[PDB]
Design a protein around this ligand. Structure first.
Ligand SMILES: CC(=O)N[C@@H]1[C@@H](O[C@@H]2O[C@@H](C)[C@@H](O)[C@@H](O)[C@@H]2O)[C@H](O[C@@H]2O[C@H](CO)[C@H](O)[C@H](O)[C@H]2O[C@@H]2O[C@@H](C)[C@@H](O)[C@@H](O)[C@@H]2O)[C@@H](CO)O[C@H]1O
Length: 553
């Protein structure tokens, strides 16, 4: 049987979601299925699909997909529409602990009838676990395998993912149907961000799923009580989901990309995608440009991630969920938030207890296997620092990935610059330094005879949205105040983005022949000054921008 979707490092997947309305044309936020697909640029379409979440169609509770006549109707309606239009779709069929979801038999028939049906999703259960979720997912996975489809599970937290793969049924099914399984994060609940990345990517490395990825959720900004960028002392509301910086969304994608991840999904869609069929700047200027990077430059393969791995942590003698300060002093000071401070260790993989130590030895023959009882954990940093050499100076985030540097400012909501000094691996230049404002990422690729630099610091000013009168409390989600916000978005944010405030990225090449540069970027959204020191051979470019800037040097 041929797969319905090709998903790997050379062929990643972007999911863009649609939400059921129990009313009207059947979809929330003024969106249409046709409008959704039209929003996907043509070069992205071969690597994209639409998620169909029943949402308000679910009864008694919105977004909890209990099997009803009305739910099945809605799935069928949307499938019908998707087919006539040839739009690849995935259905959210599991969510929030629901034990009584659509029968496996029914899904099986939908697969027979619709070649646009590429697979299904289980999303968000960490707060409402029961022992039927893993077995039910296993059964659904088995149906997906029968039809060359994918089962995609977005969930979070260390104890939860440990618990899921400890299930006999799900563990046996993952071992058989890994080709059809995508395990994926969902950092909504502002806990365990590092641990989750380790365990989930760890599953992919252990052969339990052929692909991993993420749901990058801007609701986390609301969970933190954050409001306007850098603002404190204001009450949160739904505008908080519309306030995580655009480029930061891309930085969260970068965490996945550089860890070998391959599937990208997002909430809240009113911010991250589209309202009234008008794509947002977060989508077009945040998510799209980074997904395009992932298309043009395949993510680290499984063998690449394995071969760079100097140590793994194995849950076989005590679990990472019982080590609450493990990532401190390594690469995350704050597991409530997604950004990593250090790229020195990549994502350290965590291997689930169900994987024998001997199997770990054969996946990572040159890796050190750490456990909770490891003597070396009395000097955790010093020990890991003797296996993973220091690669750069400064306080910013940088990771070496093959012949590339992946860089960002790691301050989520604090207006402070970070600097990195990057030794280089070719004689194009001796070192490269960056000064970076918050919400700026960079990719430096060393070719044999040139360097390619991508910069993106796109962040709209959210002040105008925050200045609006009205009630936008989260208790009004799925209600008309949410639509008011969604309408405002399509007339203000999405069409007149307040993105004319530039910020400075400073790029210095030391020991670089006077560089002739080729430069481009987002139209009307950058200026630059060059400076060359004849005697010291230092070349400095000062880029003022709000958006993407690309150079070849
Ligand atoms: C009972 C409870 O309070 N649960 C919340 C989750 O949110 C609520 O429960 C859901 C079943 C929905 O009815 C939702 O409308 C409701 O708020 C919550 O999940 C998400 O959290 C964000 C806030 O951080 C939003 O509320 C968002 O709409 C929720 O996500 C939806 O529901 C999920 C179950 C999935 O289906 C998503 O894909 C949906 O978009 C979590 C977050 O930690 O917290 C629970 O306590």
């Amino acid at each position: 049987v041929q797969m319905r979707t090709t998903i790997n490092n050379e062929s990643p997947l972007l999911l863009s979601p649609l939400y059921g309305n129990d009313n009207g044309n059947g979809l929330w936020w003024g969106n249409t299925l046709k409008g959704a697909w039209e929003a996907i640029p043509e070069d992205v379409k071969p690597y994209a699909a639409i998620e169909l979440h029943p949402a308000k169609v679910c009864k008694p509770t919105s977004c909890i997909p209990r099997d009803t006549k009305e739910l099945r109707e809605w799935y069928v309606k949307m499938l019908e529409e998707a087919q006539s239009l040839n739009i690849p779709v995935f259905l959210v069929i599991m969510s929030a602990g629901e034990r009584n979801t659509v029968p496996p038999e029914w899904l099986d028939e939908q697969f027979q009838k619709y070649s646009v049906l590429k697979g299904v999703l289980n999303i968000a259960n960490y707060w409402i676990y029961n022992n039927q979720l893993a077995p039910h997912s296993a059964k659904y996975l088995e149906v997906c395998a029968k039809y060359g489809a994918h089962f995609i599970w977005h969930d979070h937290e260390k104890w939860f993912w440990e618990t899921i793969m400890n299930d006999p049924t799900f563990f046996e099914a993952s071992q058989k149907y890994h080709k059809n399984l995508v395990l994926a994060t969902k950092n909504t609940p502002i806990r365990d961000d590092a641990g989750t990345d380790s365990i989930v990517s760890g599953f992919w490395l252990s052969g339990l799923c052929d692909n991993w990825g993420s749901s990058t959720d801007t609701w986390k900004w609301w969970e933190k009580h954050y409001t306007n960028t850098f603002e404190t002392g204001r009450a949160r509301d739904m505008r908080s989901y519309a306030s995580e910086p655009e480029s930061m969304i891309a930085m969260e994608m970068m965490n996945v990309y550089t860890g070998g991840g391959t599937v990208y999904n997002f909430e809240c869609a009113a911010y991250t995608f589209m309202t009234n069929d008008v794509p947002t700047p977060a989508f077009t200027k945040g998510i799209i440009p980074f997904f395009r990077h992932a298309i043009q430059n395949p993510a680290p393969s499984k063998e690449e991630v394995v071969n760079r791995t100097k140590a793994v942590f194995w849950n076989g003698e005590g679990r990472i969920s019982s080590l609450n300060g493990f990532y401190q002093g390594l690469y995350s000071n704050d597991e409530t938030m997604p950004l990593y401070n250090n790229g020195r260790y990549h994502i350290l993989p965590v291997i689930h207890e169900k994987i024998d130590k001997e199997k770990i030895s054969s996946i990572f023959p040159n890796a050190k296997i750490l456990t909770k009882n490891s003597e070396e954990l009395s000097s955790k940093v010093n020990y890991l620092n003797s296996l993973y050499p220091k690669l750069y100076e400064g306080d910013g985030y940088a990771q070496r990935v093959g012949n590339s540097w992946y860089i960002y400012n790691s301050n989520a909501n604090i207006n402070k610059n970070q600097q990195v000094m990057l030794p280089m691996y070719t004689n194009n230049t001796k070192s490269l330094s960056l000064d970076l404002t918050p919400h700026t990422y960079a990719v430096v690729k060393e070719n044999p005879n040139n360097l390619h630099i991508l910069l993106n610091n796109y962040r709209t000013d959210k002040t105008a949205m925050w200045a609006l009168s009205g009630n936008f409390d989260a208790s009004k989600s799925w209600k008309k105040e949410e639509l008011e916000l969604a309408n405002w978005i399509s007339k203000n944010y999405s069409i007149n983005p307040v993105d004319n405030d530039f910020r400075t990225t400073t790029l210095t090449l030391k020991g670089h022949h006077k560089p002739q540069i080729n430069i481009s970027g987002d139209k009307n959204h950058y200026t630059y000054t060059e400076n060359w020191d004849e005697n010291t051979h230092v070349y400095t470019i000062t880029v003022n921008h709000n958006g993407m800037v690309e150079m070849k040097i």
